[PDB]
Amino acid sequence: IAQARKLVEQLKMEANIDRIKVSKAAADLMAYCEAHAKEDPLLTPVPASENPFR
Amino acid sequence: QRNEEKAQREANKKIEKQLQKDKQVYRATHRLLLLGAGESGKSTIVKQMRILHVNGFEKATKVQDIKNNLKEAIETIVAAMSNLVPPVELPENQFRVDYILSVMNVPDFDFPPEFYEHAKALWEDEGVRACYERSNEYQLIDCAQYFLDKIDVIKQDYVPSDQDLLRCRVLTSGIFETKFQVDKVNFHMFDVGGQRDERRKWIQCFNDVTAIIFVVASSSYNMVIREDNQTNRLQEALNLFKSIWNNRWLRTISVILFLNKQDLLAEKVLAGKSKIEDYFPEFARYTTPEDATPEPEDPRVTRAKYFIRDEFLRISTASGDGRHYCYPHFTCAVDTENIRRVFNDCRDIIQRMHLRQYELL
Amino acid sequence: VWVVGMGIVMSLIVLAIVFGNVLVQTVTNYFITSLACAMGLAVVPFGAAHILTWTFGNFWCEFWTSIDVLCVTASIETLCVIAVDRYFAITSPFKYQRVIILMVWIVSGLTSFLPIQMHWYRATHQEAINCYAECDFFTNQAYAIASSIVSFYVPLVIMVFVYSRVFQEAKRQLHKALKTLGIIMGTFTLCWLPFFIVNIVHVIQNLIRKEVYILLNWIGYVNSGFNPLIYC
Amino acid sequence: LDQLRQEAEQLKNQIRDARKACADATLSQITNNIDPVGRIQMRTRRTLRGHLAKIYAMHWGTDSRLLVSASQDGKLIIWDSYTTNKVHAIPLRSSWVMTCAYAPSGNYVACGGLDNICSIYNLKTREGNVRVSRELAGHTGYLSCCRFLDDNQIVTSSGDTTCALWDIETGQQTTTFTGHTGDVMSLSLAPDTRLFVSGACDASAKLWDVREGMCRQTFTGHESDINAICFFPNGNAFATGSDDATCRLFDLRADQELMTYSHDNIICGITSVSFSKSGRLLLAGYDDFNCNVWDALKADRAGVLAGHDNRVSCLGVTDDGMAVATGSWDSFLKIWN
Numbered sequence A: 001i002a003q004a005r006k007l008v009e010q011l012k013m014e015a016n017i018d019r020i021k022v023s024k025a026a027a028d029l030m031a032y033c034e035a036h037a038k039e040d041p042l043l044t045p046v047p048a049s050e051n052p053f054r
Numbered sequence B: 001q002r003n004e005e006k007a008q009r010e011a012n013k014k015i016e017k018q019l020q021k022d023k024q025v026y027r028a029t030h031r032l033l034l035l036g037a038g039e040s041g042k043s044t045i046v047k048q049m050r051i052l053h054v055n056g057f058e059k060a061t062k063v064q065d066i067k068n069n070l071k072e073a074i075e076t077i078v079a080a081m082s083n084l085v086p087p088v089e090l091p092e093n094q095f096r097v098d099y100i101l102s103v104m105n106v107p108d109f110d111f112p113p114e115f116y117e118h119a120k121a122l123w124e125d126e127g128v129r130a131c132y133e134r135s136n137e138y139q140l141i142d143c144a145q146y147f148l149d150k151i152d153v154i155k156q157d158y159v160p161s162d163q164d165l166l167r168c169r170v171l172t173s174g175i176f177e178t179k180f181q182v183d184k185v186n187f188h189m190f191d192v193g194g195q196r197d198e199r200r201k202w203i204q205c206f207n208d209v210t211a212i213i214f215v216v217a218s219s220s221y222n223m224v225i226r227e228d229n230q231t232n233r234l235q236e237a238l239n240l241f242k243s244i245w246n247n248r249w250l251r252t253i254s255v256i257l258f259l260n261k262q263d264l265l266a267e268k269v270l271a272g273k274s275k276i277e278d279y280f281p282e283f284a285r286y287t288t289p290e291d292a293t294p295e296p297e298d299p300r301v302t303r304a305k306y307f308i309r310d311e312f313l314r315i316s317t318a319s320g321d322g323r324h325y326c327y328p329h330f331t332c333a334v335d336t337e338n339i340r341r342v343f344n345d346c347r348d349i350i351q352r353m354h355l356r357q358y359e360l361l
Numbered sequence C: 001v002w003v004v005g006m007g008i009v010m011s012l013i014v015l016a017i018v019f020g021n022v023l024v025q026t027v028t029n030y031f032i033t034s035l036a037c038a039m040g041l042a043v044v045p046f047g048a049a050h051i052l053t054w055t056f057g058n059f060w061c062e063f064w065t066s067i068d069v070l071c072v073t074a075s076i077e078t079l080c081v082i083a084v085d086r087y088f089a090i091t092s093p094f095k096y097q098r099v100i101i102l103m104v105w106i107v108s109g110l111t112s113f114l115p116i117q118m119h120w121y122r123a124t125h126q127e128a129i130n131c132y133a134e135c136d137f138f139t140n141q142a143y144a145i146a147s148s149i150v151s152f153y154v155p156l157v158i159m160v161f162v163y164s165r166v167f168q169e170a171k172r173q174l175h176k177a178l179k180t181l182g183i184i185m186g187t188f189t190l191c192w193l194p195f196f197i198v199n200i201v202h203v204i205q206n207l208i209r210k211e212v213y214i215l216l217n218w219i220g221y222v223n224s225g226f227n228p229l230i231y232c
Numbered sequence D: 001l002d003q004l005r006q007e008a009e010q011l012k013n014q015i016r017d018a019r020k021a022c023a024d025a026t027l028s029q030i031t032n033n034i035d036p037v038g039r040i041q042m043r044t045r046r047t048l049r050g051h052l053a054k055i056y057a058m059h060w061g062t063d064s065r066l067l068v069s070a071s072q073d074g075k076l077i078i079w080d081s082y083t084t085n086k087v088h089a090i091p092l093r094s095s096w097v098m099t100c101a102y103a104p105s106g107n108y109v110a111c112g113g114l115d116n117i118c119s120i121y122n123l124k125t126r127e128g129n130v131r132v133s134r135e136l137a138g139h140t141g142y143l144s145c146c147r148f149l150d151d152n153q154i155v156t157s158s159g160d161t162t163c164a165l166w167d168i169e170t171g172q173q174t175t176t177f178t179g180h181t182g183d184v185m186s187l188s189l190a191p192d193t194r195l196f197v198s199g200a201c202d203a204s205a206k207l208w209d210v211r212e213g214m215c216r217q218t219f220t221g222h223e224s225d226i227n228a229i230c231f232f233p234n235g236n237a238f239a240t241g242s243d244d245a246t247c248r249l250f251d252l253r254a255d256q257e258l259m260t261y262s263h264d265n266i267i268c269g270i271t272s273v274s275f276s277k278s279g280r281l282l283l284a285g286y287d288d289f290n291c292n293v294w295d296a297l298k299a300d301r302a303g304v305l306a307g308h309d310n311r312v313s314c315l316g317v318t319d320d321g322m323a324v325a326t327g328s329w330d331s332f333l334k335i336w337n
């Protein structure tokens, strides 16, 4: 009945959304992952004396 | 300090002791699951289990619920009289119909005593009874004739009588559970309920129950599902049974089959208004099996019962060879003795000896 | 010239049985541990060296015989307990879901170690006195018959009648039932039957020889390695 | 009437064309210049035992020392990960439970289930006991997740294609989100606690707004149901684990599926996924009795955790990024580091 009346309006609202290049997002993710790589004990094994679990 | 460690150790010891105590009582119980379709009789069985074994059996709420079913039943028959394709109709009662439509749609009703007098008179109309005999097309509650006849007894602000709770229908919004003990053994029967669903993603949770109970409406082979023009009510049950049997998760669970609602089938078969051959053409050439055990009857009704059972059994006998079993039964849910007579098959005794520690041979 | 390696080959063969037994959880799975524990590594291997007498210490022979006797009695008791548990579980399903193994082991020790530790022996005969003074094996005072009754009559008392009701339920319930039941009883009975026919024969009257009795008792000692393979 | 569908089709075509035009270069080309992390080997530092039935949910505490788990026999027990000591054992009215959560302030524990009610318990109180604080029963159909914003607000997502934001004091739904066409199975709040997502059963994921209460975006690249979801630590990307073997990493700004984590030797499903602290790892549970470890930027397997004996139904990573713990259906939890 009137279900399609609201759906088309919602889809029209969704369509008008700004989008950016994939290269910028890729660069941002790579830069963040390279910047915050120091404090990840899973990658680089923790020392035994510094490991609370051992 | 060491005091904190000692206190933590004491708390851990207490918790471990409680868990060890509870493990045995958890492991010493049997769990059962109910399944089926709408208007099949799942909750009636659990209500009867409550009535029989456990001593448990809000009376004010039941008083309103019984009257509510009576109110809905009277409106449905009259409303479809004009909308029916045939010109069937009932003179002065046309004035009664005027406020029947008005009271059909209302947030609440005060149940005036004047309503009972007019409803009883309309029920006595010859034309009104004629439309009741043709309930195949329009949907109507099964527990209608029983309540329609008994109005004055309920009318004379009253306490519900015996078997009144077992006949009234109330929808189960959530889960519906019941605990009971039969003889030094604690059981656990629960009903999933939850209206109607088509994905059943919660079925993965039930991977450890001992048995699955299946109930069908054996006297519903000419009325359609709640959403109209779909199929016969029996076919909707047959399709659901096939899906349950051929399920990845339920690959090692047995099934106990109840062919519920037996008395209605006997009454409807005696009348020749509807024939099984029309909806099920293969039944015309069907021959009764050589092995049989009729209770106490008419070969006409007896032949009908085994045909429906045969269709259900033929589904399970093909896709299941080992680790799957099917148990036919004949039950009438309302009759207290019949479920007691089944005694759950002497507690499904047949199974208890073989399934258990016999397979390893 | 070729019989030299036969004894060593048999001595090396039973090592495989010991390894298989040592290679191997629930309420009923704790009983198999006793059968796995209770012999072929120490008592059985000594026979190959004894086939030549070892004659190291007169005190050691008593332990050598008593260990084997206790192991045999423990194995018989464990199989009887297994059969009893299976019958109890199958027959009555209403109520089915360390203490008894220790009692069974304690029962074995009383009959075996006590006569050996008490130095009690057969009737003092000229051959008996000469053999005991200087490895013979023969008792008196109906010790053999009583020991057999404790350790061989238990099977026919239990194992014969334990499956009479279980197999009766097989026909009623409705092949494979007799295919595996015969293996369990057949291997048990066939290997452990012959010695009951010679121990009674020797004490009563002789009509038997030492070598044939030794061979008969050696036969069936492989039941220790046969049981681990059959179970599970 | 029928003319309405034409506008929807035209709008869908325009959206698809815009999405196609927005693509410039795949992430593989940019990220192929880095060095692989290599093999990762970890062993079970500790094992947590004491449950009777399968575990269906788990959530770490804020301090990354205490965790709460929920079983199918109706028992919530809080552990001490350092020394393996139980602290509480809370029974439940309904034995069927699918969710659990731990408050940010460590004062409440919420457990839902199939009983359609999301109850809240109290940990720190007088008399040294635990009792039900409030019971919220406004939903229809079973629940799938429960999360805490503060001590006064809790978000649930039931199986009737709805998600609501509750309120502890009032005990009524403040808002309500609608638009899905199937059961909702998971959600994960943002680090900024302003937006959250939800993976339905119609192969679609959305991006709601907590304050305004309206849908914003929609991603529908998968081919089957969706069983898990989690945000990148940045807060601008999420990874979705579906019923089929594929795992995909979407982006809020670009609105495109960047990668498709899949292997030719696996045909099983995915139950739970999560990231690491720096967003370089993508752990994922599996229905083939063990777990697996992927790489966010390389789309390759770099380690298998096979210390279990049944399927993995929950997973979590500490806020300090020091341990990774998994549950299973054989009543055993584990800690890996």
Ligand SMILES: Nc1nc2c(ncn2[C@@H]2O[C@H](COP(=O)(O)OP(=O)(O)OP(=O)(O)O)[C@@H](O)[C@H]2O)c(=O)[nH]1
Residues within 6 Å of the ligand: B037, B038, B039, B040, B041, B042, B043, B044, B141, B142, B143, B166, B167, B168, B169, B170, B171, B172, B193, B260, B261, B262, B263, B264, B332, B333, B334, B335
């Ligand atoms: N007359 C008659 N009705 C029966 C019999 N057995 C079951 N019923 C019907 O079963 C209904 C019981 O209602 P419920 O307990 O809610 O079971 P249900 O109708 O299948 O509905 P759900 O439980 O939601 O599946 C009653 O209204 C009866 O009409 C029977 O033997 N005779």
Ligand SMILES: CN[C@@H]1CCc2c(ccc(O)c2O)[C@H]1O
Residues within 6 Å of the ligand: C065, C068, C069, C070, C072, C073, C137, C144, C147, C148, C151, C199, C217
């Ligand atoms: C040399 N092996 C002996 C022979 C007789 C014998 C054994 C065990 C238990 C008994 O009751 C016996 O009579 C065997 O261990």
